[PDB]
Subunit: 248 residues, 4 copies
């Protein structure tokens, strides 16, 4: 379903913007399920709290590109909505080689995002399809931003900034290889979660709505943050590596 050129772009940049996937007849229907669920927040577990979103998660407009970059037996790992309002922000997280202190060691791989390629197919264990439900067209409007090539980085970036005592986020201060991505309502942004990315500080009025769905292999557990391994090793979850929220 993805062209050769699309695949080349997702592989080299770590994400792909697919224009105009949903006509604003469906977009409105999606926002209405979001207004309706209000009875600057995050709308958790959408597929369980709405039949309209349970259907979206399984939509071939989402599954088809996802299969093309995961190429494993698939499992829906998460689905949530987002309302980004004025002054909201999201610092950088992700990145292929960020460090994590375990008890005895430091590790530089996060296998939940560690991706490869073999015989014409990408194999990314964790990707996210962001369905945009309103336009985002400048940095100050709170645009998706990313560190170029960070999904294939061999070096850690953030640990050094922490021991230097840096206290500002790169999405504020800027970085030579930090880049923004502008989208339209109804666009899909297919994302390799190994990419180090975040969101500019929204300075403009008027809310910003998006839904996101996370897919991975059938042997991955549904997304749940975990702070460390459990005392008896029975517990499931995702332990993150160095993120800017740790020190900014």
């Amino acid at each position: 379903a993805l062209t050769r050129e699309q695949l080349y772009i997702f592989d080299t940049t770590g994400f792909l913007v697919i224009p105009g996937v949903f006509g604003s007849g469906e977009v409105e229907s999606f926002r209405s399920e979001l207004e309706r669920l209000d009875t600057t927040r995050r709308y958790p577990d959408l597929p369980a709290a709405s039949p309209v979103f349970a259907r979206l998660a399984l939509d071939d407009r989402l599954l088809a590109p996802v299969r093309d970059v995961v190429n494993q037996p698939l499992r829906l790992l998460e689905g949530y909505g987002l309302r980004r309002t004025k002054d909201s922000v999201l610092y950088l997280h992700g990145g292929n080689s960020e460090l994590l202190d375990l008890g005895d060691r430091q590790v530089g791989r996060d296998l939940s995002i560690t991706h490869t390629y073999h015989d014409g197919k990408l194999y990314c264990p964790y990707v996210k399809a962001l369905v945009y439900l309103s336009d985002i067209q400048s940095p100050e409007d709170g645009s998706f931003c990313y560190v170029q090539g960070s999904h294939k980085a061999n070096f850690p970036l953030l640990r050094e900034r922490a021991e230097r005592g840096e206290n500002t986020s790169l999405v504020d201060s800027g970085f030579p290889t930090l880049s923004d991505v502008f989208v339209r309502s109804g666009d899909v942004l297919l994302l390799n979660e190994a990419l180090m990315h975040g969101t500019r500080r929204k300075l403009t009025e008027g809310d910003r709505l998006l839904t996101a769905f996370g897919y991975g292999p059938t042997f991955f557990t549904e997304w749940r943050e975990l702070d460390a391994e459990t005392a008896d090793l029975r517990g499931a979850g995702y332990v993150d590596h160095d993120v800017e929220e740790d020190f900014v």
Copy 2:
């Protein structure tokens, strides 16, 4: 209890590592006794606080940590009795194929391991605690295809399509090798390895316990036939195994 440099070299290069004399005679007999109190024995730590302790013993955890290097989760833990004429055909292999029903894939992300800055990173490893000696092929020895854990080419798909009826475990292969162990030994295994067991011909019974470990985001081990209609089905879809055509 932590692996030496030479031990790590051997695990990386061959896909496994036999660790001698981990558990004493008394401990083995304790494990034997407990196993008898309860042919596969699924979910050991559940039904035996003796085996629950075993699963978290540092003599297993410290070497496992050195080849996984992630926050750990216990994925499976089972006991095993092998009788005469029992055989496990070949399964695993880094590049075996799998048809997804609209494409053909050559990686299994549940065993796809890597290496980075001085540390191995294997997402699925298994610790075999042997409770009896296995010292010859006819004893039903552990066997494996050399370097099969970092193979780039599939091996079994072609043999299915060429119509082979028999297992390499029986017929042999130029790189098929056996492993011999004593009671008390641990066999630390990368599940990317293509392995199985020799058909046991001798009498008596072989006993062992096995503990599978992976990162905390791996689901506990269970067979899945395929991905499900609602993308909610969880578990492990295997790739081409000899059971599929032998």
Copy 3:
């Protein structure tokens, strides 16, 4: 003059690194002047002048080069470049571009196949471009590159050839094709795995630069080769799909 953590991170992630103001304008003019002793390409500079022979070994070039090759070093080429109005350099390089070896197609060029191991980059072929004049807009013929093409797993150019395209992306534009602006006396350290080229220079004037390629000691000095010789004795570099093949 080794590379910071950050510079290493940028080179590895983008396939190149601009190192601002390495040589003062006194040294630039001395480089400028020497090149006028002779559009145009001026090959084997280290031979033709003691100034460039000295530049090829300047620790300000060798120190960053060593950090990205991390092998016993050999100087493989050194050349000058005078770029005039309407000169253009179509895209070449790229990690997974195809090559017909006759009986088969191959997708790795082992002369630019790079890796990473225990905290070090191992890039077998890197260039250091020393700029002798400003390039601050695309119309001035700026260096341009396809983002992340130094680690691409698919070919970009073969499908474009087979589909009939007759235009360079350098002129066409392409979504992930971007420009690099430099200042006189800046160095651009380049992983030759990057698919790169230059914008067509539309402005009057001459931009001058010199370029030095480095690799391991078992690499032969750069020399173009069309194919393997019949007696397997011919040495040199066979390229894969480049845009000059069909534009």
Copy 4:
């Protein structure tokens, strides 16, 4: 003589491949005869003999070599070998062995650093060993190697040297050191990234073989180099830790 699927699997997984019965016993006899006319190592056999020059280009060597290099090909090496009683070759090679460059330590040797891509192996330096006599026991001076050492991520030999070891693994043994047994007329196809050597020959009577080394057209012909030279002009191969450094 195209390598089958299983042969490629075996070569990829073990770093070598024995191809049985490539040359007839008369061809073998011709080669043996040609080696004694040239009367230990026999350097540059192709320059010495149009018989070995033709062997080097023989398709029964080039076809399997192309299947594991998959680059524009160059003949880098061609020598004869006379193995006598008490001769031994200590371990050399290995994918991750250390080398000290003078201001740093490195763990990749790009001359043997191999990869795989879209159904093809890409080994930059492979050897085809043509045996002119049977070697059927370790005491006969058999080829031996460390298992999976062509894809090793850790160094083996540094720790051994630093710990003050005196003996080579080809003598003392090692848990994963294995032997290869061959018939005259067999070819051994070898990824030079494999850590290998030969057992100490205890049996009587010379054994003979010829070896040809192949790599891409930009590799320089084989020659040892002790280090990178001050003027960056030195060409050849600097080895990493080998057992003859401390044994």
